[PDB]
Design an enzyme around this catalytic site. Structure first.
Site, PDB file in Angstrom:
ATOM      1  N   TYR B 131      38.876  47.480  35.624  1.00 22.27           N
ATOM      2  CA  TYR B 131      40.033  47.804  36.449  1.00 22.27           C
ATOM      3  C   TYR B 131      41.125  48.516  35.657  1.00 22.27           C
ATOM      4  O   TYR B 131      42.260  48.615  36.134  1.00 22.27           O
ATOM      5  CB  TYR B 131      40.607  46.540  37.097  1.00 22.27           C
ATOM      6  CG  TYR B 131      39.616  45.700  37.881  1.00 22.27           C
ATOM      7  CD1 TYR B 131      38.534  46.280  38.538  1.00 22.27           C
ATOM      8  CD2 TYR B 131      39.767  44.321  37.964  1.00 22.27           C
ATOM      9  CE1 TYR B 131      37.633  45.505  39.254  1.00 22.27           C
ATOM     10  CE2 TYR B 131      38.876  43.540  38.670  1.00 22.27           C
ATOM     11  CZ  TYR B 131      37.811  44.135  39.315  1.00 22.27           C
ATOM     12  OH  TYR B 131      36.925  43.354  40.021  1.00 22.27           O
ATOM     13  N   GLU B 200      37.968  45.849  46.567  1.00 24.90           N
ATOM     14  CA  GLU B 200      36.520  45.738  46.645  1.00 24.90           C
ATOM     15  C   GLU B 200      36.129  44.293  46.929  1.00 24.90           C
ATOM     16  O   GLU B 200      36.731  43.361  46.389  1.00 24.90           O
ATOM     17  CB  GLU B 200      35.872  46.244  45.345  1.00 24.90           C
ATOM     18  CG  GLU B 200      34.364  46.396  45.387  1.00 24.90           C
ATOM     19  CD  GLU B 200      33.644  45.163  44.880  1.00 24.90           C
ATOM     20  OE1 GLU B 200      32.398  45.120  44.967  1.00 24.90           O
ATOM     21  OE2 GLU B 200      34.331  44.239  44.392  1.00 24.90           O
ATOM     22  N   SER B 201      35.127  44.123  47.798  1.00 25.55           N
ATOM     23  CA  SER B 201      34.586  42.816  48.197  1.00 25.55           C
ATOM     24  C   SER B 201      35.726  41.969  48.756  1.00 25.55           C
ATOM     25  O   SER B 201      36.356  42.394  49.741  1.00 25.55           O
ATOM     26  CB  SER B 201      33.823  42.219  47.013  1.00 25.55           C
ATOM     27  OG  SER B 201      33.056  41.094  47.413  1.00 25.55           O
ATOM     28  N   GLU B 329      23.582  46.395  48.545  1.00 27.24           N
ATOM     29  CA  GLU B 329      24.641  45.392  48.558  1.00 27.24           C
ATOM     30  C   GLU B 329      24.108  43.987  48.302  1.00 27.24           C
ATOM     31  O   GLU B 329      24.812  43.158  47.713  1.00 27.24           O
ATOM     32  CB  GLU B 329      25.383  45.432  49.896  1.00 27.24           C
ATOM     33  CG  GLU B 329      26.272  46.649  50.091  1.00 27.24           C
ATOM     34  CD  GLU B 329      27.565  46.566  49.289  1.00 27.24           C
ATOM     35  OE1 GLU B 329      27.833  45.506  48.682  1.00 27.24           O
ATOM     36  OE2 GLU B 329      28.314  47.565  49.263  1.00 27.24           O
ATOM     37  N   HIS B 442      25.952  45.453  44.103  1.00 29.38           N
ATOM     38  CA  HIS B 442      27.330  45.232  44.516  1.00 29.38           C
ATOM     39  C   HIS B 442      28.278  45.350  43.329  1.00 29.38           C
ATOM     40  O   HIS B 442      28.039  44.769  42.267  1.00 29.38           O
ATOM     41  CB  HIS B 442      27.441  43.844  45.152  1.00 29.38           C
ATOM     42  CG  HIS B 442      28.809  43.506  45.650  1.00 29.38           C
ATOM     43  ND1 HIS B 442      29.282  43.931  46.874  1.00 29.38           N
ATOM     44  CD2 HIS B 442      29.800  42.768  45.097  1.00 29.38           C
ATOM     45  CE1 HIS B 442      30.508  43.475  47.050  1.00 29.38           C
ATOM     46  NE2 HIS B 442      30.847  42.770  45.985  1.00 29.38           N
TER      47      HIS B 442
END
Ligand SMILES: *[C@@H]1O[C@H](CO[C@@H]2O[C@@H](C)[C@@H](O)[C@@H](O)[C@@H]2O)[C@@H](O[C@@H]2O[C@H](CO)[C@@H](O)[C@H](O)[C@H]2NC(C)=O)[C@H](O)[C@H]1NC(C)=O
Ligand SMILES: *[C@@H]1O[C@H](CO[C@@H]2O[C@@H](C)[C@@H](O)[C@@H](O)[C@@H]2O)[C@@H](O[C@@H]2O[C@H](CO)[C@@H](O)[C@H](O)[C@H]2NC(C)=O)[C@H](O)[C@H]1NC(C)=O
Ligand SMILES: NC(=O)c1cc[n+](COC[n+]2ccccc2/C=N/O)cc1
Ligand SMILES: NC(=O)c1cc[n+](COC[n+]2ccccc2/C=N/O)cc1
Ligand SMILES: *[C@@H]1O[C@H](CO)[C@@H](O)[C@H](O)[C@H]1NC(C)=O
Ligand SMILES: *[C@@H]1O[C@H](CO)[C@@H](O)[C@H](O)[C@H]1NC(C)=O
Ligand SMILES: *[C@@H]1O[C@H](CO)[C@@H](O)[C@H](O)[C@H]1NC(C)=O
Lengths: 531, 533
Positions: B131, B200-201, B329, B442
C-alpha cells in the site's frame, strides 16, 4: 384362389390381400378382430377376447378408427391431416393387422409389433405413415399393429370402481400381444421373437408393458421413439383421474354421489359427446398435456413408472430409444403465445415467460422461475430467435428428451443393453416451416420405408437413408443389436452416455442427451417441488 | 535546519513529515498523523473521538502501530501470506492516517485518493509495503491518503441498541478520517472537492457502505471497488446474529462471570486484547471459508437498511464508480479450510471433497440450496474430473462472495444514474509466490495499482513496469475526471444491458461482455427466491 391369403387362426378363417411394393409383393391381413366390440355395457370395461366365428372374415381392408378428436388447427394441412383418422370412427374398433412376406414364411420369422402414439387421445393403425409393406418386404419380418381405445373410452378411470377401472386401452394392447403369442405362427411369425416399437404415447405404452409383469412375458425387446413411461404427461394419479372423470360427467349432463350411477349415465351418451368435452377437464392451459392417460392405481402399474424403473432388474433386456432433433417445436403451435406455423414465431420475452407456464403446467412459481433461469441467455435475454428456440427446448426436454434420458440411464446402469439415437434429418417433403427443424413424429416415415413409395417425392439419398434405418431397426429386432457386421453404434451407458446421430451422413457418435438440461429436470427440480 | 516543504499546519496543530526517495523523484510523506483519541481502556468498542489539539510539532515521520488483530499462521514465513501480516507492532492505539503529496507541494489544488485496506474486517493495516503510496503520487501527481481503522471485535463487536458496543465503530473510524481529509487536505495541496475513495475486498465493501450512508456520502465524490461489494454475503450481519456472536465471545473469555449490556462490555474491557483475538473465530456458527466473526452490522444507524435494499432504492446520478475483480477470486480462500486444498500440491480434489467444499464455501443454506449450487457448477459429462472440480469450487466461492455481488452492484448503479466502469484483472505477476493452479488470486492487482513494480529492489519485468504505469494512469484518469480514459483502445462504461468490461493485462485493452452472467443470474436472481420460499 390364392392359398397364401387364407389363414386359420384360433377364432376361425381369414381372407387376406396381396399388396404391391417397388420390391415385390407382400401379404396383408387387415382388420382382424381380436376383441369383442366394447359397445354399450362394455364401454370403459376391459376388453374381452373375440368369440370364435364361422365362415371367412374379410381381412382385406383397414377397420374403423377408435373414437377420437379430430385436429382442426390447420384444416387440410398435410402436416396435421397425416395424423387424423383416415377411416370412419367407431367404438367397434378393436382390430389388428398382420403384414408378412409373399409367399408366407414357412420358418419362424421375427415379429415387430407397432403401437401408435397420439397422446393417448388419438391415433390409428391405418394411417399411411404406418404402412407396414416396405419394412416387411425389405427386412423379411412379420409386422403386427393394433388399434386400442383412446381418450375417455380407453383411459377414463374411477379408481377402485369396477365399471371404469381405467387403463383398458393398455389392456387392449396386451390382448393383442396375447393374440400374437397364440396366432402369429399361423402367418409364419415367431412368437419367441417379438419386438415392440412405438412412438410418443406408443413409446410410453411400450414402457408400461416392460414395467407390468403380465405383459413382460409377451415380448422380448423394446423400441421407444420420442416417448417414455415416466414422462410428466404419460400417467396420472388416482385422485386427479377421478376428478377428471367426474368433471366430464358433469359437463355432459350426468350426476352427481356414486360411481355406479355415474358410469351408467356416461354409457348412455353418444361417443362424440364425450369427445367434444374431453378437453375441458384439464386443470389449466397447457401444451403436451392430455386428459385421459394411464392411471397409477396399483394394478397394471403397481407403482409409478419412475419407482418401477429405479427398482427394476433389467438384465437380459435390449432396448432401442431415441428422439428427434426438435421435440418441442410441433407442440408450441397448439397453445404457446406467439407461435404459428405460418410466421417465424419470433416471440417476445413476455410471450416466452407466458409460454413457460403453458409448457410446464401445474408447478409452483419458484419451479417456473428455475426453468426461466436455466433456459435464459442473460447476455441476450430478449432475443426472439433464441427465446423461440429456448421454449422449444423447454417443452422438448421436459416432456421427451429428459424422460427418455432418465429411462436410458437407469436401464443401462441396472443391466439392460441400451442403444440411443438422435434423428436429425429434415425430410425434403416436410410441410412444416423451417424454424421447427426436425419436429416430433417425422422419423416414423423413414422407419417404415415410406420414401421407397415411388408415388412420393423423396430424394434418392433419402431412400437409401430409409433403407439404412429399416436395417438398423430390423437388426435390433433380430439380435438385440442394430449394428451391421462402419462405424459402429455403441451401447448407451450411464457414464459415457454415448448415442449416434441419424441423418444422411454416416453414423456420428456423441456424448450426452442434453446432459446439462436434463440434470435440471431429473435431479434438481423434483427436490424443489417436494420442499 | 528545517525543510519548509515538510512542515504543515493542520487544525489539531503542527506536523513534521519526511521526504521520500522514489525512482522518478522526491515525494513528501506525513505518516502516522493522529486523527482520533486512542480507543483504549474505557474507549474500547466506543465510537472514535476526534484528536484533541496539541502544542508543538508532531513528527509524522513513520507508520504508526497496526490495529490489534489476528496474525495469519497457515504458511509461516511464506511470502504470499506474510505480505498481508502486520509489519508494525500491534496496539489498540492505532487510529492514525497517512498523507503523501508531491515534492514540491502542489501550486494548484490536486485531486485526492483515499485508500481503505481490506482483510475481512479482522485484519489489515495502511503500513503494508504493497500500500506504499509514494509511486502513485510521484507518477500521477495525486494526493493519496490512507487510514488505519479498528478490526475484529475492537472495530465491529456489536451489542445492538447498547451504548458501549453500538457496532460499526471501525466504519466510524473511516468516516472520521474522511472528515479529517475534508478539513485538512488543502493544507497539503489536496482538493477537498475532488476526493475518490478506493479499496479492496473488505475495503471495497467499506467504500460501498460509505456510498450508502448519507453522513459519509458528502465526504467524497467518486468510488473504486476492487474485488468487493457491500452486498456480499460476508460483509454484513444482522443485529441478532451480531448480538449472539458478541455474547458468545464474552462468554468464552469469562464475561459475565448476557444481562445488562454495560456490565458485559465492562467485563470485556478488562480482558487483554490478545485474549479477545485468540477466541474471536470460535463464534462463527459453522466451519467455513470467506466468513468473518465481526463485520458491519445492519442496525438502522450507519446502514438504515440492508446494502441490497439501499442499492436498489438509491439514486446515483452525479456519481462515477470503477469496479472490478481478479481472474480467480476464489482460489486464495480455498486453502483456508476447503478439504483437499493446499498451496503445496495441485489440489485435484475428489467429488466427495467437492460436495464437502460446497457447504464450506456457501455456509448456512438449506440442503436444497446446496444442491442447486451443485447442479449449476457440475459438468454432467465430466462429473468427477478432479481438475474441473477444483476450478468449479474456485468459481463457487468467487462468484458467490465477490464476482456476483460486484456485478449486482454495478448493474443497479448503472441503471440508476451512475456511470460505471468495470474490469477483470488477468495478469499473473512474474513474482507471484502462490502455485500456478491458483491463477490470478484475490488481492494481486493491488501491487500494480500502487506501482510497486517500480520499486528498484524488486525483480519485476520491464513489461510489468509499463503495465503498472498504465494502471496507475487509469485510476488517476478516473479520480481526476471520473473517466479512466485519457485526454488508444477506449474503455467503455458498464451498463446493465451490454455489460461491457475490459481485461487488464500486458496486452492492450480488450472489451468483453458479461461478468459471469449465467452464473451470477443464479446467485443474484434465482437463489434469493429459493431461500425465501
Ligand atoms: C404470428 O401469428 C400469431 C398468431 O396469429 C395467427 O396467425 C397469423 C399468421 C395470422 O393468421 C393471424 O390472423 C392469426 O391470428 C400471432 O400471435 C397472435 O397475435 C394477435 C395480434 O396480432 C393476438 O391477438 C393473438 O392473441 C396472438 N395469438 C397467439 C397464439 O400468440 C403473432 O403475433 C404473429 N407474429 C408475427 C406477426 O410474427
Ligand atoms: C494435498 O495436501 C492436502 C493437505 O495436506 C497438507 O499438504 C500436504 C502437501 C502435506 O504437506 C501434508 O502434511 C499437509 O497436511 C491433503 O489433504 C489433507 O490430507 C491429510 C492426510 O491425508 C489429512 O489429514 C488432512 O485432513 C487433509 N486436509 C485437507 C485440506 O483435506 C491432500 O490429500 C493432498 N492431496 C494430494 C497432494 O494428493
Ligand atoms: N378432445 C379435444 O377436444 C382435444 C382438443 C385438443 N387436443 C390437443 O390436440 C392438439 N394437439 C395436436 C397435436 C399435438 C399436440 C396437441 C396438443 N397438445 O396439448 C386434444 C383433444
Ligand atoms: N481470530 C482468529 O483466530 C482467526 C482465525 C482465522 N481467521 C481467518 O484467517 C484465515 N484466512 C486468511 C486469509 C483469507 C481467508 C481466511 C479465512 N477465511 O475464512 C481470522 C481470525
Ligand atoms: C410432389 O408430388 C405432387 C403429387 O401430387 C406433385 O404435384 C408435386 O409437383 C411434387 N413436388 C415437387 C417439388 O415435384
Ligand atoms: C446496568 O447497570 C448499571 C449499574 O452498574 C446501571 O447504571 C445501568 O442503568 C444498567 N443498564 C441500563 C441499560 O440501565
Ligand atoms: C531478486 O529479488 C531478491 C529480493 O527481492 C534479491 O535478493 C535478489 O538479488 C534479486 N535477484 C535475484 C537474481 O534473486
Amino acid at each position: 384362389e390364392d392359398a397364401e391369403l387364407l389363414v386359420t387362426v384360433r377364432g376361425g378363417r381369414l381372407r387376406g390381400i396381396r399388396l404391391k411394393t417397388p420390391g415385390g409383393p407382400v401379404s396383408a391381413f387387415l382388420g382382424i378382430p381380436f376383441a369383442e366390440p366394447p359397445m354399450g355395457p362394455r364401454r370403459f370395461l376391459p376388453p374381452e377376447p373375440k368369440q370364435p366365428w364361422s365362415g371367412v372374415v374379410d381381412a382385406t381392408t383397414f377397420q374403423s378408427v377408435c373414437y377420437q378428436y379430430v385436429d382442426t388447427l390447420y384444416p387440410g394441412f398435410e402436416g396435421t391431416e397425416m395424423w387424423n383418422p383416415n377411416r370412419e370412427l367407431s367404438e367397434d374398433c378393436l382390430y389388428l393387422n398382420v403384414w408378412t412376406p409373399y409367399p408366407r414364411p414357412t420358418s419362424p420369422t421375427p415379429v415387430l409389433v407397432w403401437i401408435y402414439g397420439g397422446g393417448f387421445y388419438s391415433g390409428a393403425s391405418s394411417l399411411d405413415v404406418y404402412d407396414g409393406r416396405f419394412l416387411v418386404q425389405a427386412e423379411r419380418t412379420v409386422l403386427v399393429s393394433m388399434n386400442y381405445r383412446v381418450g375417455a373410452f380407453g383411459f377414463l378411470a374411477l379408481p377402485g370402481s369396477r365399471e371404469a377401472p381405467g387403463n383398458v386401452g393398455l389392456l387392449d394392447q396386451r390382448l393383442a400381444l396375447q393374440w400374437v403369442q397364440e396366432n402369429v405362427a399361423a402367418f409364419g411369425g415367431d412368437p419367441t421373437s417379438v419386438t415392440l416399437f412405438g412412438e410418443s404415447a406408443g413409446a410410453a405404452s411400450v414402457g408400461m408393458h416392460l414395467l407390468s409383469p403380465p405383459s413382460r412375458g409377451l415380448f422380448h425387446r423394446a423400441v421407444l421413439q420420442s416417448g417414455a413411461p415416466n414422462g410428466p404427461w404419460a400417467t396420472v394419479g388416482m385422485g386427479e383421474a377421478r376428478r377428471r372423470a367426474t368433471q366430464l360427467a358433469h359437463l355432459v349432463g350426468c350426476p352427481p354421489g356414486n360411481d355406479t350411477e355415474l358410469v351408467a349415465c356416461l354409457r348412455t351418451r353418444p361417443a362424440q359427446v364425450l369427445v367434444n368435452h374431453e378437453w375441458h377437464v384439464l386443470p389449466q392451459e397447457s401444451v403436451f398435456r392430455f386428459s385421459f392417460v394411464p392411471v397409477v392405481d396399483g394394478d397394471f402399474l403397481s407403482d409409478t413408472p419412475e419407482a418401477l424403473i429405479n427398482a427394476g432388474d433389467f438384465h437380459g433386456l435390449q432396448v432401442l430409444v431415441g428422439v428427434v432433433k426438435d421435440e418441442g417445436s410441433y407442440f408450441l403451435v397448439y397453445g404457446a403465445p406467439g407461435f404459428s406455423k405460418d410466421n417465424e414465431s419470433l416471440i417476445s420475452r413476455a410471450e416466452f415467460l407466458a409460454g413457460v407456464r403453458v409448457g410446464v403446467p401445474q408447478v409452483s412459481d419458484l419451479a417456473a422461475e428455475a426453468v426461466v433461469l436455466h433456459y435464459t441467455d442473460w447476455l441476450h435475454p430478449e432475443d426472439p430467435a433464441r427465446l423461440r428456440e429456448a421454449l422449444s427446448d423447454v417443452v422438448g426436454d421436459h416432456n421427451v428428451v429428459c424422460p427418455v434420458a432418465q429411462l436410458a440411464g437407469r436401464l443401462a446402469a441396472q443391466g439392460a443393453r441400451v442403444y440411443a439415437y438422435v434423428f436429425e434429418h429434415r425430410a425434403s417433403t416436410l410441410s412444416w416451416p423451417l424454424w421447427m427443424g426436425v419436429p416430433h413424429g417425422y422419423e416414423i416415415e423413414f422407419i417404415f420405408g415410406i420414401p421407397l413409395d415411388p408415388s412420393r417425392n423423396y430424394t434418392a439419398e433419402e431412400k437409401i437413408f430409409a433403407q439404412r434405418l429399416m436395417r438398423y431397426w430390423a437388426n435390433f429386432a433380430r439380435t438385440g443389436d442394430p449394428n451391421e457386421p462402419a462405424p459402429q453404434w455403441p451401447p448407451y451407458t450411464a457414464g459415457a452416455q454415448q448415442y449416434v446421430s441419424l441423418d444422411l451422413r454416416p453414423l456420428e457418435v456423441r456424448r450426452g442427451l442434453r446432459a446439462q438440461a436434463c440434470a435440471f429436470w431429473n435431479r434438481f427440480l423434483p427436490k424443489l417441488l417436494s420442499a
